[PDB]
Design an enzyme around this catalytic site. Sequence first.
Site, mmCIF file in Angstrom:
data_model
loop_
_atom_site.group_PDB
_atom_site.id
_atom_site.type_symbol
_atom_site.label_atom_id
_atom_site.label_comp_id
_atom_site.label_asym_id
_atom_site.label_seq_id
_atom_site.Cartn_x
_atom_site.Cartn_y
_atom_site.Cartn_z
ATOM 1 N N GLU A 12 47.918 48.046 46.282
ATOM 2 C CA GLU A 12 46.749 48.659 46.911
ATOM 3 C C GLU A 12 45.728 48.748 45.793
ATOM 4 O O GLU A 12 46.105 48.552 44.618
ATOM 5 C CB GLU A 12 47.053 49.918 47.688
ATOM 6 C CG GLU A 12 47.816 50.993 46.958
ATOM 7 C CD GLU A 12 48.726 51.949 47.700
ATOM 8 O OE1 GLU A 12 49.025 51.779 48.898
ATOM 9 O OE2 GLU A 12 49.126 52.961 47.042
ATOM 10 N N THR A 14 41.026 48.975 44.798
ATOM 11 C CA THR A 14 39.664 49.361 45.196
ATOM 12 C C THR A 14 39.337 49.131 46.657
ATOM 13 O O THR A 14 38.983 50.061 47.386
ATOM 14 C CB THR A 14 38.618 48.641 44.312
ATOM 15 O OG1 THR A 14 39.050 48.787 42.962
ATOM 16 C CG2 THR A 14 37.230 49.251 44.469
ATOM 17 N N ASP A 78 50.918 38.964 37.876
ATOM 18 C CA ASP A 78 49.640 39.305 37.241
ATOM 19 C C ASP A 78 49.886 39.589 35.771
ATOM 20 O O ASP A 78 51.016 39.740 35.290
ATOM 21 C CB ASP A 78 48.799 40.457 37.820
ATOM 22 C CG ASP A 78 49.518 41.754 37.590
ATOM 23 O OD1 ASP A 78 49.812 42.342 36.506
ATOM 24 O OD2 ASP A 78 49.942 42.319 38.593
ATOM 25 N N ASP A 119 34.263 43.194 37.685
ATOM 26 C CA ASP A 119 35.423 44.044 37.538
ATOM 27 C C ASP A 119 36.660 43.448 36.861
ATOM 28 O O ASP A 119 37.823 43.535 37.353
ATOM 29 C CB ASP A 119 35.691 44.561 38.963
ATOM 30 C CG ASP A 119 36.564 45.778 38.714
ATOM 31 O OD1 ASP A 119 36.460 46.300 37.560
ATOM 32 O OD2 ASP A 119 37.370 46.127 39.574
ATOM 33 N N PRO A 122 43.330 43.231 33.628
ATOM 34 C CA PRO A 122 44.590 42.518 33.622
ATOM 35 C C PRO A 122 45.207 42.358 34.988
ATOM 36 O O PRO A 122 45.575 41.207 35.240
ATOM 37 C CB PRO A 122 45.413 43.311 32.611
ATOM 38 C CG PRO A 122 44.357 43.721 31.601
ATOM 39 C CD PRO A 122 43.346 44.289 32.564
ATOM 40 N N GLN A 123 45.197 43.278 35.933
ATOM 41 C CA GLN A 123 45.663 43.097 37.300
ATOM 42 C C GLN A 123 44.868 42.059 38.094
ATOM 43 O O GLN A 123 45.344 41.729 39.146
ATOM 44 C CB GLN A 123 45.506 44.388 38.132
ATOM 45 C CG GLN A 123 45.956 45.649 37.436
ATOM 46 C CD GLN A 123 44.876 46.178 36.477
ATOM 47 O OE1 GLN A 123 44.615 45.879 35.303
ATOM 48 N NE2 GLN A 123 44.135 47.132 37.082
ATOM 49 N N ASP A 137 39.703 37.964 42.941
ATOM 50 C CA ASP A 137 38.719 38.939 43.383
ATOM 51 C C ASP A 137 37.329 38.749 42.818
ATOM 52 O O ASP A 137 36.570 39.716 42.820
ATOM 53 C CB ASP A 137 39.083 40.431 43.144
ATOM 54 C CG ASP A 137 40.284 40.746 43.995
ATOM 55 O OD1 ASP A 137 40.351 40.181 45.135
ATOM 56 O OD2 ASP A 137 41.155 41.537 43.597
HETATM 57 N N1 LIG Z 1 46.216 36.246 45.251
HETATM 58 C C1 LIG Z 1 47.161 37.107 44.898
HETATM 59 N N2 LIG Z 1 48.401 36.593 44.737
HETATM 60 C C2 LIG Z 1 49.431 37.407 44.344
HETATM 61 N N3 LIG Z 1 49.391 38.707 44.086
HETATM 62 C C3 LIG Z 1 48.133 39.184 44.261
HETATM 63 C C4 LIG Z 1 47.023 38.455 44.650
HETATM 64 N N4 LIG Z 1 45.942 39.199 44.703
HETATM 65 C C5 LIG Z 1 46.356 40.360 44.386
HETATM 66 N N5 LIG Z 1 47.673 40.493 44.065
HETATM 67 C C6 LIG Z 1 48.207 41.621 43.282
HETATM 68 O O1 LIG Z 1 48.260 42.635 44.243
HETATM 69 C C7 LIG Z 1 47.985 43.931 43.679
HETATM 70 C C8 LIG Z 1 46.801 44.554 44.418
HETATM 71 O O2 LIG Z 1 45.614 43.777 44.056
HETATM 72 P P1 LIG Z 1 44.283 44.566 44.347
HETATM 73 O O3 LIG Z 1 43.110 43.681 44.521
HETATM 74 O O4 LIG Z 1 44.396 45.388 45.608
HETATM 75 O O5 LIG Z 1 44.151 45.626 43.126
HETATM 76 P P2 LIG Z 1 43.621 45.550 41.593
HETATM 77 O O6 LIG Z 1 43.542 44.168 41.156
HETATM 78 O O7 LIG Z 1 44.594 46.317 40.774
HETATM 79 O O8 LIG Z 1 42.250 46.346 41.706
HETATM 80 P P3 LIG Z 1 40.936 45.858 42.444
HETATM 81 O O9 LIG Z 1 40.909 46.448 43.820
HETATM 82 O O10 LIG Z 1 39.697 46.214 41.742
HETATM 83 O O11 LIG Z 1 41.029 44.392 42.656
HETATM 84 C C9 LIG Z 1 47.633 43.724 42.198
HETATM 85 O O12 LIG Z 1 48.924 43.829 41.512
HETATM 86 C C10 LIG Z 1 47.215 42.207 42.234
HETATM 87 O O13 LIG Z 1 47.405 41.681 40.897
HETATM 88 MG MG LIG Z 2 42.396 42.751 42.466
#
Ligand SMILES: Nc1ncnc2c1ncn2[C@@H]1O[C@H](COP(=O)(O)OP(=O)(O)OP(=O)(O)O)[C@@H](O)[C@H]1O
Ligand SMILES: [Mg+2]
Length: 290
Positions: A12, A14, A78, A119, A122-123, A137
């Site tokens: 989950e 932003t 990630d 934004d 590392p995630q 993103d």
């Molecule tokens: N395309 C993808 N493939 C595999 N896992 C993903 C993918 N996109 C997102 N995730 C993983 O899912 C989780 C949620 O991503 P999410 O975009 O909701 O949050 P975030 O990257 O931590 O913050 P933000 O909302 O700013 O992007 C994170 O661990 C992200 O690295």
């Molecule tokens: Mg993200």
Amino acid sequence: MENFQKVEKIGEGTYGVVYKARNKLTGEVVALKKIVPSTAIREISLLKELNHPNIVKLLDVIHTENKLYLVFEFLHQDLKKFMDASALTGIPLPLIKSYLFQLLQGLAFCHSHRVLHRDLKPQNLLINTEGAIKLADFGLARAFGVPVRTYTHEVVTLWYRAPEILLGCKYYSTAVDIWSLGCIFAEMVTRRALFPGDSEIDQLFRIFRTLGTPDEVVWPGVTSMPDYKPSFPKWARQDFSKVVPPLDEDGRSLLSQMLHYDPNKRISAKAALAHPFFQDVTKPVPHLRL
Ligand SMILES: Nc1ncnc2c1ncn2[C@@H]1O[C@H](COP(=O)(O)OP(=O)(O)OP(=O)(O)O)[C@@H](O)[C@H]1O
Ligand SMILES: [Mg+2]
């Protein structure tokens, strides 16, 4: 959105909640983000044409019932998790190097089309088994807004935010993504966040204590930024050799130009790709447990 079976809640954040899911037609495995504003629909839709190998592909935009669903290419890990897995040992330098180089190609691409991530963290950096690393993103912050509190109460990180955004610059440029990737680069090298603030003033004051309080000498126009305060404490800069120790001088020299205070002096992604640090760049494969 009933055309997908949910396998598992990846996370989950932003904007919404990310599930791993499968196409009931294809059998394709995807990341399904559940997030509608018309301006936000057209902008999300032109992001679909932004394709590049170091950018996580936006497969499709499913707008139904005031609900928006973004279907992205899926990647198994990630960079945050790869980093936590490699803590004891550290990421070998040649892989860090490959990673920075490919992220810079991703940024040179998007920046040449005028798109900013705004934004990076590392995630949002996704890696596979062949040695590739992709930005996830990209474009979403401008297309929907970047909240204080991420959707699930989680607080977006400030650790990677450029100083002009923190000082309230309204029209910041593509230089803010180069600041963030510099902070990630430093963190891959040392295995610890460079500027872990837990608030906006703490964030600022952690940047000031390593790089020195900025003034009109290093940054023309800084003192008339909206959240600039003449009462800010005056701290001297520290040397990079103390900041990211193991890194060699090509590496520190590239890092310091990514961390320039003035966004007009900050290196661009395209000039950074021609920096001498990348002279011996290779593409190694990481050690990954899926
Ligand atoms: N395309 C993808 N493939 C595999 N896992 C993903 C993918 N996109 C997102 N995730 C993983 O899912 C989780 C949620 O991503 P999410 O975009 O909701 O949050 P975030 O990257 O931590 O913050 P933000 O909302 O700013 O992007 C994170 O661990 C992200 O690295
Ligand atoms: Mg993200």
